[PDB]
Amino acid sequence: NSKPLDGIKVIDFGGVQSVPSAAQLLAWYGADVIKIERVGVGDITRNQLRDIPDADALYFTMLNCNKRSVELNTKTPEGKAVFEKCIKWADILLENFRPGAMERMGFTWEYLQQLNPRLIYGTVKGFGENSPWAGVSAYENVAQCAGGATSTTGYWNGAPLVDGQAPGNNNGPLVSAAALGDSNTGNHLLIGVLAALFGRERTGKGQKISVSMQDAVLNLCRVKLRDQQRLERVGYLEEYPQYPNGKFGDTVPRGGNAGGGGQPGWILKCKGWETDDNAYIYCTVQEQDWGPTCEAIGKPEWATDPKYNTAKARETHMFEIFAAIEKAIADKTKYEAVAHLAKYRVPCSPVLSMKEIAEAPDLRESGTIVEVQQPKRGTFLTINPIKFSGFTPEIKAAPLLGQHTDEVLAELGYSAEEIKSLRDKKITCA
Amino acid sequence: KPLDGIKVIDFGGVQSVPSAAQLLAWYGADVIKIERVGVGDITRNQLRDIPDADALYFTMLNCNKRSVELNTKTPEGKAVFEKCIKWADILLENFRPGAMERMGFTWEYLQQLNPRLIYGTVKGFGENSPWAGVSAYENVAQCAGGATSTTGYWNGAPLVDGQAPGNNNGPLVSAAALGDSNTGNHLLIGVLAALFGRERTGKGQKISVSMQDAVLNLCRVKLRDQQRLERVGYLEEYPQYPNGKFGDTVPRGGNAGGGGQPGWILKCKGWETDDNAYIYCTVQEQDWGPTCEAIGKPEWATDPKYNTAKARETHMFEIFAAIEKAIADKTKYEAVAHLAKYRVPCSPVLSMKEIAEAPDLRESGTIVEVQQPKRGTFLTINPIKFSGFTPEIKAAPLLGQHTDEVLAELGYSAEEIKSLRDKKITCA
Ligand SMILES: CC(C)(COP(=O)(O)OP(=O)(O)OC[C@H]1O[C@@H](n2cnc3c(N)ncnc32)[C@H](O)[C@@H]1OP(=O)(O)O)[C@@H](O)C(=O)NCCC(=O)NCCS
Ligand SMILES: CC(C)(COP(=O)(O)OP(=O)(O)OC[C@H]1O[C@@H](n2cnc3c(N)ncnc32)[C@H](O)[C@@H]1OP(=O)(O)O)[C@@H](O)C(=O)NCCC(=O)NCCS
Numbered sequence: 001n002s003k004p005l006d007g008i009k010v011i012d013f014g015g016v017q018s019v020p021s022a023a024q025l026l027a028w029y030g031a032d033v034i035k036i037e038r039v040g041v042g043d044i045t046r047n048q049l050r051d052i053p054d055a056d057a058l059y060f061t062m063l064n065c066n067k068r069s070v071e072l073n074t075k076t077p078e079g080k081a082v083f084e085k086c087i088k089w090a091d092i093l094l095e096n097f098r099p100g101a102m103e104r105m106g107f108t109w110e111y112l113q114q115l116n117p118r119l120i121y122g123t124v125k126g127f128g129e130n131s132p133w134a135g136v137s138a139y140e141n142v143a144q145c146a147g148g149a150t151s152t153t154g155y156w157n158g159a160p161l162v163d164g165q166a167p168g169n170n171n172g173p174l175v176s177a178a179a180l181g182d183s184n185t186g187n188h189l190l191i192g193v194l195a196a197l198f199g200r201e202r203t204g205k206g207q208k209i210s211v212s213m214q215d216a217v218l219n220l221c222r223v224k225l226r227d228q229q230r231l232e233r234v235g236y237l238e239e240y241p242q243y244p245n246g247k248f249g250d251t252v253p254r255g256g257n258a259g260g261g262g263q264p265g266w267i268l269k270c271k272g273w274e275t276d277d278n279a280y281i282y283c284t285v286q287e288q289d290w291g292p293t294c295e296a297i298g299k300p301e302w303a304t305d306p307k308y309n310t311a312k313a314r315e316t317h318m319f320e321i322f323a324a325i326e327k328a329i330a331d332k333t334k335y336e337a338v339a340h341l342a343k344y345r346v347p348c349s350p351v352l353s354m355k356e357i358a359e360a361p362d363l364r365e366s367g368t369i370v371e372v373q374q375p376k377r378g379t380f381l382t383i384n385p386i387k388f389s390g391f392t393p394e395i396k397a398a399p400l401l402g403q404h405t406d407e408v409l410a411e412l413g414y415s416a417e418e419i420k421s422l423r424d425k426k427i428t429c430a
Numbered sequence: 431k432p433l434d435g436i437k438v439i440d441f442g443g444v445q446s447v448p449s450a451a452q453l454l455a456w457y458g459a460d461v462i463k464i465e466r467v468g469v470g471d472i473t474r475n476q477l478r479d480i481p482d483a484d485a486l487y488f489t490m491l492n493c494n495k496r497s498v499e500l501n502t503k504t505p506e507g508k509a510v511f512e513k514c515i516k517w518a519d520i521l522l523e524n525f526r527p528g529a530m531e532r533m534g535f536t537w538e539y540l541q542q543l544n545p546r547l548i549y550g551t552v553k554g555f556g557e558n559s560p561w562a563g564v565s566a567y568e569n570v571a572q573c574a575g576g577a578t579s580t581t582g583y584w585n586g587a588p589l590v591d592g593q594a595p596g597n598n599n600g601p602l603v604s605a606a607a608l609g610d611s612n613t614g615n616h617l618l619i620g621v622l623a624a625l626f627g628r629e630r631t632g633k634g635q636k637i638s639v640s641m642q643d644a645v646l647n648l649c650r651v652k653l654r655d656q657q658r659l660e661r662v663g664y665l666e667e668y669p670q671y672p673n674g675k676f677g678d679t680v681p682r683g684g685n686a687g688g689g690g691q692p693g694w695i696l697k698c699k700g701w702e703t704d705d706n707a708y709i710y711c712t713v714q715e716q717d718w719g720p721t722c723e724a725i726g727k728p729e730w731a732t733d734p735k736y737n738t739a740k741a742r743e744t745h746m747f748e749i750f751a752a753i754e755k756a757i758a759d760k761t762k763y764e765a766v767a768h769l770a771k772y773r774v775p776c777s778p779v780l781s782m783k784e785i786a787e788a789p790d791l792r793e794s795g796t797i798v799e800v801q802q803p804k805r806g807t808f809l810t811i812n813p814i815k816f817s818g819f820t821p822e823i824k825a826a827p828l829l830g831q832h833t834d835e836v837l838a839e840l841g842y843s844a845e846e847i848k849s850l851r852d853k854k855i856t857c858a
Contacts, residue, residue: 137775148605385644
């Protein structure tokens with residue numbers, strides 16, 4: 001029924017993924033969200049990798065549902081004055097433009113507070129204010145490289161040798177498909193903004209939330225910072241693939257598809273792997289019930305072999321064990337492999353392609369993947385991750401550029417003459 | 431502090447719930463962590479680096495909490511749990527499916543115990559998922575959510591240095607905790623939203639997040655790509671275009687950059703012995719001239735085979751190779767400085783050692799040194815900064831350190847507390 005953010009007013013003053021994704025979530029939870037975009041072209045996502053020539057790209061519609069679009073050139077004195085009225089209207093202002101942009105536009109945090117002492121200002125940059133990289137261009141992959149994720153993702157070089165490795169020392173840092181830099185930073189920003197919004201109820205005061213992309217990536221790599229400290233003290237990482245047949249250095253190495261503390265595991269080929277990039281499962285060799293594991297893979301002999309039957313003894317032979325499992329499932333599809341290993345309660349799970357995910361009926365039924373009616377496009381799918389017992393979001397079309405400009409100006413108190421004037425002066429259009 | 435006076439129960443383990451609860455404590459919440467007797471949160475005993483001290487896994491996830499040791503499978507322990515629930519504004523839980531219910535603590539019951547309770551629950555999958563039975567481990571979530579399928583290298587053309595040979599390029603796990611920490615962030619978002627709405631409605635609610643869904647959410651762009659793929663049959667920005675083939679599902683793209691401009695991770699001097707002697711580099715449309723100078727290929731500036739993004743598509747990997755050649759004799763930092771002079775966008779790949787020791791990160795309070803009993807100091811991460819306050823981060827609790835203290839605040843007499851202890855409801 002009633003939505004938690006009903007009557008909360010938000011300005012989405014950003015682009016791409018971090019800020020818009022957070023603002024989209026706010027709208028879905030009830031917020032009145034207006035997106036102020038540059039004239040003529042709007043948010044960069046509108047025009048990036050279109051699949052339908054005359055329509056807004058999917059990048060944009062999947063990040064900007066339930067918003068109203070305001071076209072506005074804040075780099076003009078008239079535009080700035082309109083923006084200042086918007087700022088007074090809003091509870092929340094979110095921005096992620098390049099370092100110094102807001103400042104050159106006339107909007108220091110000090111000034112923003114002057115305009116609206118209730119304002120909760122959320123700002124995202126690639127790096128913290130004091131970083132030696134503050135001048136680096138902050139793309140998704142730059143944040144992943146800066147925050148420890150690429151360093152610690154992918155394969156190691158050398159022993160133990162495994163099929164997925166590149167030859168020699170060509171196993172380098174690897175980018176993650178997940179938006180550690182973008183959407184993830186948005187999540188962190190939303191945490192800060194909502195904490196601030198709650199605190200504002202008692203104090204009546206706004207404040208500034210700052211999240212850097214590097215820091216948000218690092219937060220998701222908290223366990224890698226854990227491992228770094230273990231490594232420095234202990235000299236090795238016992239659960240890593242390199243122990244005991246490889247070599248550790250002074251920094252956390254890449255670990256392939258390793259399971260981690262107390263739950264050793266790996267991603268294994270299934271029938272069809274040579275032509276199907278997703279004919280794979282994940283399988284754990286658990287530190288209990290080794291007996292059933294042995295039977296599942298046809299190694300009943302291992303249940304008693306002193307070289308296997310203790311959690312801490314199969315610690316050293318895992319890759320032989322993984323190979324035995326793949327041999328046991330080499331004739332099975334991933335779904336057949338899972339069903340076979342489940343017979344014995346060997347914990348495992350399929351690797352699911354985006355096609356299988358997109359088509360999954362259980363994800364439609366739960367409201368996690370939602371089909372949305374979009375003009376000039378038809379329908380498209382979006383993701384709604386967090387479920388509330390009290391209400392369900394009503395997800396609606398993403399706005400055309402400037403579709404609501406005059407409606408919002410009117411809502412702000414501008415007469416019909418000033419509105420035509422602003423559009424005449426090319427403040428609200430190109 | 432914005433969560434001052436808010437009462438929170440951490441009734442979870444590992445990362446998702448405890449990380450969310452730790453942030454809450456940092457923002458001012460009064461957080462108690464109810465842990466099973468004797469061993470407590472699994473993170474306490476996992477990969478200890480100091481034998482008789484709690485593991486770093488635990489300390490980095492449980493600062494600023496009080497520990498209550500409690501056997502919630504006993505009728506005495508259940509009674510205690512119920513009093514805590516009535517005390518609490520927020521209850522967070524991530525135990526295996528049906529576990530809360532088996533104790534009798536259904537959502538329907540919790541709503542009646544405390545109509546103001548905000549209840550956050552994490553599970554591997556949605557309740558009606560065909561995978562609902564499956565053990566919800568981090569790598570499982572990454573595999574179910576789309577991440578592993580779309581992370582790693584493709585097989586076949588175009589052939590590049592970091593590929594496995596033949597068709598041995600498979601799904602790959604990300605170092606980032608997509609399934610665990612990321613899920614706790616999503617949980618926290620819903621919890622803070624409901625906490626706010628409670629101000630107007632006066633009632634709590636239940637927030638549910640599945641690990642599969644949280645992973646999927648971070649892979650929003652890959653669901654975008656799936657729909658693009660299904661509509662047009664190819665993806666313009668992927669390494670496979672134009673020289674490879676697209677199938678029916680989004681393929682792995684190695685170190686490719688998203689939308690804006692082509693990019694890749696390039697070797698620098700020392701890559702044969704230093705796993706992290708690398709940078710990330712983007713090939714910009716603008717300033718192609720300086721880019722050509724930067725790599726000792728002035729020859730390319732006027733060449734219509736190269737001087738436009740469109741002509742470059744067919745041989746983007748030739749371009750990257752030339753850049754690598756030009757920085758073959760430079761460290762990643764030297765490579766960065768060289769390439770920046772020509773306005774080519776690039777950045778170093780940083781190792782965990784480099785990050786952990788970074789003075790800017792200590793100075794901003796992003797990496798924080800914490801004093802911890804039986805250990806000395808360790809480092810933790812605090813990612814969101816507030817102009818209104820700065821968290822005062824303190825030691826993670828010893829197991830049951832605050833049991834008797836919390837029970838006394840809950841109104842238990844010293845005699846009740848002593849019997850609970852003697853009967854081993856509050857200890858092993
Ligand atoms: C993504 C990014 C690199 C884009 O680079 P960019 O397109 O070259 O620069 P921006 O789009 O950020 O900003 C360009 C200018 O447009 C201006 N602008 C923004 N909105 C405007 C509007 N409605 N009207 C007129 N001008 C506007 C900005 O103020 C900025 O002015 P400036 O010349 O004084 O700097 C940059 O936004 C960034 O680093 N963001 C920080 C972290 C982040 O969230 N990145 C997002 C993707 S991972
Ligand atoms: C992490 C996980 C896989 C562990 O599985 P597990 O160790 O076999 O089981 P759990 O630790 O969750 O719970 C075991 C039991 O201890 C009980 N328990 C929890 N706290 C207790 C306490 N203080 N006293 C007594 N019993 C307690 C639980 O109720 C549960 O009871 P049950 O036998 O009726 O099911 C599982 O907790 C999980 O799937 N959680 C959901 C998603 C998640 O966040 N996973 C984290 C890893 S990425």
